[PDB]
Amino acid sequence: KTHVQLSLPVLQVRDVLVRGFGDSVEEVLSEARQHLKDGTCGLVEVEKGVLPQLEQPYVFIKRSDAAPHGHVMVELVAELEGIQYGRSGETLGVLVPHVGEIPVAYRKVLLRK
């Protein structure tokens, strides 16, 4: 399938134990896709002072369309030192590994895979 329905656990930034996917744009996008497939991916909602608490490169999920079965269509965009790899709509948040942190919510997304 080109698209996969996922329910992403929304984590508070100060709870997150593993604050990025790796060390290159290519690695963080690879790791993010692997974690999304394995259901081991969390989402941190971006506000003032969130991103400097996380490790670059960042992986964003961004709205790719204006929402089948409740699930917002999103794609992945990486960022490193102010340069983004990908072009998409509004940020729904930043992806991080999930290692058993208790979420505050779930974000239903349809991932272009």
- 3-state secondary structure (DSSP) of residue 51: helix
Structure determination technique employed: X-ray
Please give the C-alpha separations between residue 27 and each of 22, 23, 58, 70, in angstroms, as whole numbers. 6, 7, 11, 30
Does residue 84 contact residue 75 with C-beta atoms inside 8 Å? no
**Resolution of the model in angstroms:** 2.1
Rounded CA-CA distance 35/76 in Å is 13
- 3-state secondary structure (DSSP) of residue 52: helix
Rounded CA-CA distance 29/76 in Å is 7
Which numeric CATH code is attached to 3-112? Answer: 2.30.30
Rounded CA-CA distance 86/14 in Å is 27
Number of CB atoms found within 10 A of residue 99's CB: 10
